[PDB]
Amino acid sequence: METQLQSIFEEVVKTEVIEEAFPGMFMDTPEDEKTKLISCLGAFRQFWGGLSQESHEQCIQWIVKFIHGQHSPKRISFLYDCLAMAVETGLLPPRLVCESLINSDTLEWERTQLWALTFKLVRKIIGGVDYKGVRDLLKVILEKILTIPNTVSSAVVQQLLAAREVIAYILERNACLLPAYFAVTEIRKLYPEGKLPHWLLGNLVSDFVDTFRPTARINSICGRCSLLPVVNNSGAICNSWKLDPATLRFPLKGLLPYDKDLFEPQTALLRYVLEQPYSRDMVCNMLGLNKQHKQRCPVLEDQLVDLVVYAMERSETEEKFDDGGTSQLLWQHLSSQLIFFVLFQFASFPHMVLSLHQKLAGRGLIKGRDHLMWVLLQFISGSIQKNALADFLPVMKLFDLLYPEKEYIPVPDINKPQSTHAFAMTCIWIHLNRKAQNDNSKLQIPIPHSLRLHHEFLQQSLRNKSLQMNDYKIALLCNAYSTNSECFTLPMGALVETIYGNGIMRIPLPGTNCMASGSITPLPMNLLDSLTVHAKMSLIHSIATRVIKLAHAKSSVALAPALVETYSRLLVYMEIESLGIKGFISQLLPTVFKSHAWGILHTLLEMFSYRMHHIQPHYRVQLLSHLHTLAAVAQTNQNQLHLCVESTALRLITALGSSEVQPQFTRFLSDPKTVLSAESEELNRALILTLARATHVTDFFTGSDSIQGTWCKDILQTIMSFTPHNWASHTLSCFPGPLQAFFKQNNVPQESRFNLKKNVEEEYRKWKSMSNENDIITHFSMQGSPPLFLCLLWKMLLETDHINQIGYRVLERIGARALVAHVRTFADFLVYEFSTSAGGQQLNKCIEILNDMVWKYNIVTLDRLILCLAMRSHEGNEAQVCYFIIQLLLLKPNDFRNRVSDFVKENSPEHWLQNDWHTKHMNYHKKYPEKLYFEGLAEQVDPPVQIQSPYLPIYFGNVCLRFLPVFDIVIHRFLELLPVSKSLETLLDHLGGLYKFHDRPVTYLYNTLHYYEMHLRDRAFLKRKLVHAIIGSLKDNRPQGWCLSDTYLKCAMNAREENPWVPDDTYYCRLIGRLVDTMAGKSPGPFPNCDWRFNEFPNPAAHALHVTCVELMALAVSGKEVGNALLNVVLKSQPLVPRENITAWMNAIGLIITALPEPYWIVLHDRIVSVISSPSLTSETEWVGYPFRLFDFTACHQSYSEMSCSYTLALAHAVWHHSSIGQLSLIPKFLTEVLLPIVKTEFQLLYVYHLVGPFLQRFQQERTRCMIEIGVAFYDMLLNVDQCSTHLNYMDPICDFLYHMKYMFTGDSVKEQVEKIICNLKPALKLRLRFITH
Amino acid sequence: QVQLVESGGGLVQAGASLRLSCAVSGRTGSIYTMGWFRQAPGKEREVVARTTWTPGSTKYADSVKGRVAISRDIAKNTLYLQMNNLKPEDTAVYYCAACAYGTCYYGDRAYEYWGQGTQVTVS
Question: Which candidate, A399, A409, A1018, B114, has a CA 20 to 30 Å from the CA of A345?
Answer without folding.
Answer: A399
